[PDB]
Design a protein around this ligand. Structure first.
Ligand code: HAS
Ligand code: HEM
Ligand code: OLC
Ligand code: OLC
Ligand code: OLC
Ligand code: OLC
Ligand code: OLC
Ligand code: OLC
Ligand code: OLC
Ligand code: OLC
Ligand code: OLC
Ligand code: OLC
Ligand code: OLC
Ligand code: OLC
Ligand code: OLC
Ligand code: OLC
Ligand code: OLC
Ligand code: CUA
Ligand code: CU
Lengths: 166, 546, 31
């Protein structure tokens, strides 16, 4: 009864533990897949790229928001975004649809989020560091940037815009 | 039994922290339902300057202070009472005072709007030195606790050479050793960086390093929150349910996995950080999936023990065992309901861990949805239930029938509010609503969220009532006049264990070895990345933006 | 057999899977 309850519970537990392991491993496979595809573009670049948050608005590629969009390949554009208290420059960001876009975002003040509503772009922005993420916009139109990292009282109304041209 | 009095002091201070921390939650729930009640709150609590100050208090008081005081109460007293030995009292009282003192010190700038950072206090957001100092002292209180319990265990082992560590004490030893490794990230971040910087001694801090050190502690701290509740769920709840723990070894295995896997995982809070190599994010991701294992395991061990209890009590069929359980006992109800909500809780955590899937939910209302299921519901509810057995044991004070019934109402309301809130927050989060946002102050910004916003309003009103009923309840039991010494003298309702193959238990009892392994894993998982970051520091100036 | 314990880990498995495959869909839809 306890004798019989004991080894029966343990026997099924062993099954459960093996299944749940298999499920965990399946998720690992399925994650590794995402990692081999264009959708992984949104993972930040692992490489350290240091800048000086105090002169970033005075010189270098974030100094002039109207030249932030640079063609860097035949179908590729690099965009230097500044995320700051409390906005994003340029505004709007303007990019062609169908082109791979390499966002290079930094902050002059405190940490900000860079969440592009309707896409997987969702990257912390750290003063002193350039966050680099990649995306291709398949659909034209207007995409809102959301700050999703508390940055002070201006936080809830820190928004940006990206326009994707046909 | 002077350890009762010190334990009591930890529990009560914890519960005071939870009450004050919780005052702010209905306000925040209303906010995630597009309703601004902050003007009312600032009438009642005129020192409160912003939604964000509310949010710091809530985070700090609920997720840091209460949880810790609870852990320190439970994972000192229970092992002591299983071993029948007295804790070093001078040390025990020392830890309480460090805790109280660091709490008073951090509180001053908090109450005075000088530290409206969050509970994550991320640099370059720069709070008052007293916030960092007091939080430091508050958390070091736990190194004393670790000592206290290590002592007890060695004193026991000495007196009983050649025996395996008893269950609850085994749980507490592996738990505290885990927490010691785990805590080094934050002590590092604090000592090398936050403190000097807040004192004026260095100009800036490197935000990435600060975050990396933070999340070294920031993950395993949530297992530090959980494990006290698990110890209860494992070694006490099966008795209260009317049965027994189905396996002592499976319970040790779960805890041992927590020792090994709780700390080398923190990059799962940094899937969206620059400057951390993706291959390391994947390693942490895998290690994070593994840490889900002791809980998958726990799901089955605990579920089989409740079923067992229900079968003993007469229930039959596939659900009869559920029906047969003691649903009139809040001390049984509270953890069980917590456990039920832990199912979607852990499902959401498994999502957060998958490296790329985190881009869907990161920094949205999804995350508060996940964690209110884990800590604000399972851990808190389990602490709430201990009112109904831990308190009488500690004080001799009786629980009246009236109080038992009220406790049932609190525990169900609190549970129900947290489920309803969890739907509103997961769903809002899937619609891209950001966490940490006074969104009701931008009422036209999240129109596609109108439906889950109704759940948050509801949740907020249900958890207000639950909380008001908790305060009236908690004070009824604390302030009552009577003391019956047969409650004080009674044993803790420790479960018996159905029996255990000794091979496994002996191995698991080589604690020095498992500890060393856990320490190696942390070096392998954090060493390489921290060496690169420390080689390339880019300190930046701090900012007050409140 | 511990039939209840099995039902519980059924519900938990279903829940994990609806959550995980759910979010995986959303991931690719936003990709
Ligand atoms: C106590 C508090 C916590 C626990 C426990 C916890 C568990 C997990 N979490 Fe987490 N979570 C992390 C992923 C996980 C994973 C993989 C697990 C696992 O350990 C979960 C395993 C659990 C299970 C697989 C469930 C087992 C179910 C059981 C055991 C119930 C059985 C029921 C019974 C027996 C009832 C039967 C009775 C009857 C009557 C039927 C990740 C990412 O990988 C993030 C970052 C996301 C982001 O983007 O920021 C996240 C962020 C947080 C934050 C936000 C930090 C911040 O402020 O930024 C907090 C506070 C938190 C707390 C908690 N977390 N989590
Ligand atoms: C009356 C019960 C409660 C309600 C209604 C409530 C509500 C909320 C809401 C709506 C948020 C999200 C606010 C935002 O992201 O801007 C939040 C945040 C949070 N809550 Fe709760 N809560 C309650 C109790 C608890 C408890 C018991 C805990 C832990 C024991 C807890 C821990 C936290 C933490 C750590 C945060 C994140 C703070 C941050 O991001 O800085 N809450 N709460
Ligand atoms: C034990 C207690 C458990 C708690 C259960 C309480 C349930 C909440 C009440 C629902 C009744 C419906 C009332 C809704 C009517 C008012 C709605 C309203 O007008 O809200 C403000 C307005 O929308 C701003 O513009
Ligand atoms: C499409 C994906 C599938 C989803 C569908 C849900 C899967 C069920 C989940 C867990 C069951 C785990 C329990 C495994 C049973 C093990 C058998 C066992 O251990 O049997 C020994 C015993 O003595 C008998 O004779
Ligand atoms: C006992 C049975 C043993 C058999 C064990 C098998 C486990 C089955 C599970 C998953 C396979 C993973 C499939 C990976 C393919 C991913 C394709 C995809 O998800 O498409 C996304 C998108 O449209 C493109 O960009
Ligand atoms: C009980 C909990 C229930 C949960 C309820 C589930 C609701 C989740 C809904 C959608 C997520 C899918 C995300 C798809 C986002 C694509 C929308 C889009 O593309 O819009 C922006 C674009 O700029 C236009 O030009
Ligand atoms: C400010 C710091 C004061 C620290 C005050 C600490 C007082 C400790 C009192 C205590 O709990 O210890 C027993 C003591 O010997 C008497 O009864
Ligand atoms: C012993 C108790 C407290 C130590 C007191 C420490 C005193 C720290 C004073 C330094 C300070 O307050 O520096 C502020 C400045 O604005 C930098 O940001
Ligand atoms: C309780 C812990 C409080 C921490 C305070 C001091 C610990 C040691 C800090 C020593 C400060 C060294 C300052 C320094 O040399 O910094 C280099 C400077 O940034 C280049 O110009
Ligand atoms: C038992 C412990 C398990 C440890 C082993 C786990 C397996 C990790 C292996 C390779 C990750 C490859 C990731 C490369 C991703 C780069 C994506 C990208 O190109 O974005 C910029
Ligand atoms: C939108 C979500 C909000 C809704 C929340 C729903 C979540 C599940 C709720 C309850 C499950 C509890 C199941 C177990 C209840 C057991 C009580 C029982 O079986 O009764 C025996 C009787 O009381 C003699 O003591
Ligand atoms: C249709 C959805 C409507 C939204 C729900 C509104 C929220 C709460 C209602 C009040 C709930 C009070 C439930 C308490 C259950 C209880 O206390 O029962 C003890 C029982 O004897 C076994 O433990
Ligand atoms: C478990 C307890 C029941 C929970 C929620 C009731 C669901 C009510 C949700 C209905 C939508 C209400 C709404 O806000 O309207 C939609 C939109 O704005 C159109 O114009
Ligand atoms: C026993 C008592 C239990 C009854 C409890 C009810 C259970 C579920 C139903 C309603 C919750 C309604 C609360 C929502 C309050 C108003 C919501 C709101 O603010 O709606 C705005 C609208 O969608 C745009 O203007
Ligand atoms: C001293 C720090 C303690 C860290 C190591 C704990 C394990 C250990 O000490 O193993 C030997 C034990 O004392 C035999 O009873
Ligand atoms: C007692 C607790 C035990 C745990 C059990 C509760 C766990 C909840 C599980 C699933 C909720 C998902 C609800 C349905 C999924 C929605 C999918 C969907 O509708 O997708 C949007 C689509 O685009 C159309 O608008
Ligand atoms: C009981 C309290 C706990 C509450 C439990 C939390 C509720 C969240 C539920 C399910 C997540 C599943 C993800 C939803 C998947 C639907 C979206 C989808 O299917 O995506 C395809 C579409 O094309 C994309 O735009
Ligand atoms: Cu920028 Cu929040
Ligand atoms: Cu974590």
């Amino acid at each position: 009864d306890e004798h019989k309850a004991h080894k029966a519970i343990l026997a099924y537990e062993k099954g459960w533990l093996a299944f749940s392991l298999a499920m965990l491993f399946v998720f690992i496979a399925l994650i590794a897949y995402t990692l081999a595809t264009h959708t992984a573009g949104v993972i930040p670049a692992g490489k350290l790229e240091r800048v000086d948050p105090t002169t970033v608005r005075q010189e270098g590629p974030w100094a002039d928001p109207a030249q932030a969009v640079v063609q860097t390949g035949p179908n590729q554009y690099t965009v230097y975004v500044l995320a700051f208290a409390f906005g994003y420059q340029p505004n709007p960001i303007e990019v062609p649809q169908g082109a791979e876009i390499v966002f290079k975002i930094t902050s002059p003040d405190v940490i900000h989020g860079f969440h592009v509503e309707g896409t997987n772009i969702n990257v912390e922005v750290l003063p002193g560091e350039v966050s680099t993420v990649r995306y291709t916009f398949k659909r034209p139109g207007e995409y809102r940037i959301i700050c999703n990292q508390y940055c002070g009282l201006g936080h809830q109304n820190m928004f940006g815009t990206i326009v994707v041209k046909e | 039994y002077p350890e009762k009095k010190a334990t009591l002091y930890f529990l009560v201070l914890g519960f005071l922290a939870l009450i004050v921390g919780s005052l702010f939650g209905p306000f925040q729930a209303l906010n995630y339902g597009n309703v601004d009640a902050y003007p009312l709150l600032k009438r009642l609590l005129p020192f409160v300057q912003s939604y964000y100050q509310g949010l710091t208090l809530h985070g700090v008081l609920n997720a840091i202070v209460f949880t810790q005081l609870f852990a320190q109460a439970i994972m000192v007293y229970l092992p002591a009472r299983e071993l029948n030995m007295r804790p070093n009292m001078g040390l025990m009282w020392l830890s309480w005072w460090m805790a109280f003192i660091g709490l008073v010190v951090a509180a001053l700038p908090l109450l005075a709007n000088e530290a409206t950072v969050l509970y994550t206090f991320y640099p370059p957001l720069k709070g008052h030195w007293a916030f960092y100092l007091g939080a430091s002292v508050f958390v070091l209180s736990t190194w004393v606790s670790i000592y206290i319990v290590l002592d007890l265990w060695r004193r026991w082992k000495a007196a009983n050479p050649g025996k395996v560590t008893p269950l609850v004490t085994y749980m507490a030893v592996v738990f505290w050793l885990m927490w010691f490794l785990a805590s080094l990230g934050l002590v590092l971040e604090f000592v090398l960086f936050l403190l000097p910087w807040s004192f004026g001694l260095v100009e800036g801090v490197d935000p990435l390093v600060a975050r990396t050190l933070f999340w070294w502690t920031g993950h395993p701290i949530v297992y530090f929150w959980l494990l006290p509740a698990y110890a209860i769920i494992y070694t006490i709840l099966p008795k209260q349910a009317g049965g027994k723990l189905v396996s002592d070894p499976m319970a040790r295995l779960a805890f041992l996995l927590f020792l090994l896997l709780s700390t080398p995982v923190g990059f799962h809070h940094q899937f969206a950080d620059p400057g951390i190599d993706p291959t390391w994010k994947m390693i942490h991701s895998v290690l994070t999936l593994f840490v889900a294992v002791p809980s998958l395991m726990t799901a089955f061990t605990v579920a089989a023990s409740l079923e067992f209890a229900g079968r003993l009590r007469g229930g039959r069929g596939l659900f009869g065992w559920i029906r047969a359980l003691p649903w009139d006992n809040p001390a049984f109800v509270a953890p069980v309901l917590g456990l039920l909500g832990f199912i979607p809780g852990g499902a959401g955590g498994i999502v957060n861990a998958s490296f790329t899937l985190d881009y869907v939910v990161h920094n949205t209302a999804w995350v508060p949805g996940h964690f209110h299921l884990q800590v604000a519901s399972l851990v808190t509810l389990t602490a709430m239930g201990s009112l109904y057995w831990l308190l009488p044991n500690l004080t001799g004070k009786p629980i009246s029938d009236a109080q038992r019934r009220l406790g049932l109402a609190v525990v169900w309301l609190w549970f129900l509010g947290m489920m309803i809130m969890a739907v509103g927050l997961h769903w809002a989060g899937l619609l891209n609503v950001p966490r940490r946002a006074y969104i009701a102050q931008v009422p036209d910004a999240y129109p596609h969220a109108a439906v889950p916003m109704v759940f948050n309003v509801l949740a907020g009103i249900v958890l207000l009532v639950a909380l008001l009923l908790f305060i009236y309840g908690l004070f009824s039991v604390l302030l009552s006049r009577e003391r019956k010494p047969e409650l004080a003298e009674a044993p803790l309702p420790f479960a018996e264990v159905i029996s255990e193959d000794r091979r496994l238990v002996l191995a698991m009892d080589r604690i020095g070895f498992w500890f060393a392994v856990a320490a190696i894993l942390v070096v392998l998982a954090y060493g390489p990345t921290l060496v690169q970051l420390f080689g390339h520091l880019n300190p930046v100036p701090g900012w007050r933006l409140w | 057999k511990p039939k209840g314990a099995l039902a519980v880990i059924l519900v938990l498995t279903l829940t994990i899977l609806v959550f995980w495959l759910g979010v995986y869909a959303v991931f690719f839809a936003r990709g």
